[PDB]
Amino acid sequence: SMVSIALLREMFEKMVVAKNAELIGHYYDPDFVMYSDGLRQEFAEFNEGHRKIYASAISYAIEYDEDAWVQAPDRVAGRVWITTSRPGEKPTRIEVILIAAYRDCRIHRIWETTWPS
Amino acid sequence: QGPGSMVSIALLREMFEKMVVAKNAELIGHYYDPDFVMYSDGLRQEFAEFNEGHRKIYASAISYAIEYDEDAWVQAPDRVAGRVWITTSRPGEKPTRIEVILIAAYRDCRIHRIWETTWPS
Ligand code: NA
């Protein structure tokens, strides 16, 4: 496989599912910018926002549409379902189509849209 | 690998320009395979419905404009991902701008699958 897809999947497992905010600076470049559903967020705000939510009672599960992966040098696109659970609530499933571009094996840009928003 | 396997960005752009912006329904079967399926914001649509629906809308007063995020492309053999904005206008209505992130898988230079999500929905 290509390096980018493997790193993206590792980030989703070890950072997101594990809610490990100490790995944000491991997987994401200091100049990272996220574009998501009309919002633009640079590294510092992405980092602080994820530190706060990972400290909450939420939990995450992640799965992928294997048929949708696109992989190229320093780039990957995929179709991801993120299922979020909170104590006392029904889980909610969000579909994300995302493009990730890497610099020196860290995520430098993500562009994503989600359904529902 | 055939020549078309490495030019999916160019093929997708040509489809947006000559099929969508030009509203040319005769090119639907040229750019899309008969077993094409679209997934868009949770809806699945097959070729027959995609074709008939676009034949009807292209005969209407709608117009389309396309903007590309030229920094967001991913290109691999028989595959492309990108980020575009589609703005649609109708007489007497404010234009509507939709961001689309899409993945297209090709087979023999025709689109076989699209998976996309949009903002707003
Ligand atoms: Na074009």
Side-chain angles (χ1 to χ4, degrees), chain A residues 3-89 91-117, chain B residues 2-48 50-93 95-121:
Chain A
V3 177
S4 52
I5 184 169
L7 291 175
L8 188 75
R9 295 179 68 141
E10 188 187 300
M11 179 283 299
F12 273 121
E13 178 68 20
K14 300 298 188 172
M15 183 184 120
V16 180
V17 171
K19 300 193 331 183
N20 186 345
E22 289 190 351
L23 294 175
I24 295 166
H26 179 73
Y27 291 114
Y28 292 76
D29 187 91
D31 301 321
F32 172 67
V33 183
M34 168 65 87
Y35 295 88
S36 179
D37 292 347
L39 179 75
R40 184 188 182 273
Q41 192 168 54
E42 297 206 342
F43 182 89
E45 289 74 24
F46 178 81
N47 182 48
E48 180 56 17
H50 282 72
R51 289 180 74 83
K52 292 191 160 302
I53 201 70
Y54 290 174
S56 79
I58 202 165
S59 56
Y60 298 101
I62 302 286
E63 67 184 15
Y64 305 104
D65 188 340
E66 185 189 12
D67 296 335
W69 288 114
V70 190
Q71 39 195 129
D74 265 353
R75 295 193 167 232
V76 55
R79 180 179 192 218
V80 186
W81 291 275
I82 306 182
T83 301
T84 288
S85 302
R86 280 172 186 106
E89 322 214 8
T92 56
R93 184 173 169 94
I94 301 168
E95 181 185 343
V96 184
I97 307 277
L98 71 85
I99 298 165
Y102 281 77
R103 174 163 68 186
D104 303 339
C105 288
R106 297 193 184 86
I107 301 166
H108 184 242
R109 296 284 180 272
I110 287 172
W111 302 270
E112 68 183 26
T113 49
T114 71
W115 181 74
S117 301
Chain B
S5 67
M6 320 306 222
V7 299
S8 298
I9 294 166
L11 286 171
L12 191 74
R13 191 191 299 274
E14 192 192 288
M15 180 280 299
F16 276 122
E17 295 305 311
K18 297 300 186 181
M19 183 184 112
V20 178
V21 172
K23 298 168 50 183
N24 188 347
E26 301 308 293
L27 291 174
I28 294 166
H30 171 72
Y31 289 116
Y32 292 80
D33 272 320
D35 70 329
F36 166 70
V37 177
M38 163 81 83
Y39 293 86
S40 182
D41 294 343
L43 258 54
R44 187 177 191 280
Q45 189 174 60
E46 307 206 324
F47 179 87
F50 180 85
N51 183 42
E52 195 42 71
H54 284 86
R55 287 180 77 76
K56 289 181 187 147
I57 206 179
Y58 288 173
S60 78
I62 200 171
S63 55
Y64 296 95
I66 310 297
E67 169 95 347
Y68 303 96
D69 185 337
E70 300 289 353
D71 296 336
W73 295 111
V74 192
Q75 188 170 240
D78 303 302
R79 295 185 165 243
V80 54
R83 177 185 194 220
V84 302
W85 295 264
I86 302 173
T87 301
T88 51
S89 305
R90 293 189 158 253
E93 312 190 23
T96 299
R97 174 187 169 86
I98 303 293
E99 180 182 346
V100 183
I101 300 181
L102 75 167
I103 294 164
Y106 284 76
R107 286 180 184 190
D108 309 313
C109 306
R110 296 203 280 179
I111 300 165
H112 176 245
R113 287 288 180 275
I114 287 172
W115 304 269
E116 66 182 30
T117 49
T118 73
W119 185 76
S121 286

